[model samples]
Target: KGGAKRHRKVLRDNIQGITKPAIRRLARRGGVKRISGLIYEETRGVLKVFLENVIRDAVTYTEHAKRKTVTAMDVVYALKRQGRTLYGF
Candidate 1:
């Protein structure tokens, strides 16, 4: 039981990558109203996974370039490497 609680905490901490309100706001901007609770939960889960993978890849890029900081370009390159290329930096 304690282990499950800890895991839940870890998942929540990992997803501090984005806020619930921010996600909801984005949905609103996309003309969505009455967003469901499950939508927020799933969005956070997906965001957590995507961010973890992208940041890990970006960190490798930074290390390869002998840089201490992960740059925007590194992230872009990482996304491209994963075939999820983002536009409009």
Candidate 2:
């Protein structure tokens, strides 16, 4: 039970590497104290990172694609390539 609890905590905290400090910063930017109070606040840097990676990976996977432009599907493909699944899905 203890191990399970710890694992759950890790998952909750690790699912998005949104540290308490980062959450505080985002909260301050949005005039809130708790991230739980904000909608879509849970994904943290992962979404930003995934979007950035999608753009980079798209070009990497292509022969003549510009590194600056990425399609929405590219992000999906990048996530798929990582073998990661949507947490709630």
Candidate 3:
């Protein structure tokens, strides 16, 4: 795993090794895997790119904030800070 693109960080809480899995589960629950539901022709490339930036910015912000876990609030705040899709489904 010397050149791994990403590495897992263990979360403090678990029940049946649930921390990482919990995050994945929550993401799927939030409709992350199927972006098609959220994405549209008008957005096309820009929206996806914007979401990427939001996650990136959220990562940086959370790490800087010394937060142990990333939250939906962190992501939404990051996206909103960029002034993208302010009021839509």
Ranking by lDDT: 1, 3, 2
Better of 2 and 3 by lDDT: 3
Q: Flag clash pairs in model 3.
A: none
The true-versus-predicted C-alpha distance at residue 26 of model 2, in Å, is 18
lDDT for residue 41 in candidate 3, whole number 0-100: 35
Which clashing pairs does model 1 show?
none
Q: Compose the digit string of candidate 1's lDDT tens values, residues 1-89.
A: 35544444433465665788899888999999787678988888887788788889999999999979888899999999877968888
Model 2: how far residue 69 lies from native, Å: 7.5
Error of 3 at 89 (Å): 14
Query: Local error of candidate 3 at 37, Å?
Result: 18
> 42, model 2: CA deviation in Å?
4.5
TM-score of 3: 0.39
lDDT by residue for model 2 (1-89), tens: 35544444433455356656766776689787655644456456556676566656655655355455655565556667766554332
Query: Which window of ten consecutive residues has the lowest lDDT sum in model 1?
Result: 3-12
lDDT of each candidate versus the true structure:
0.84, 0.58, 0.62
Please give the distance, in angstroms, between residue 35's alpha carbon in candidate 3 and its true position after superposition.
18
Error of 3 at 27 (Å): 23
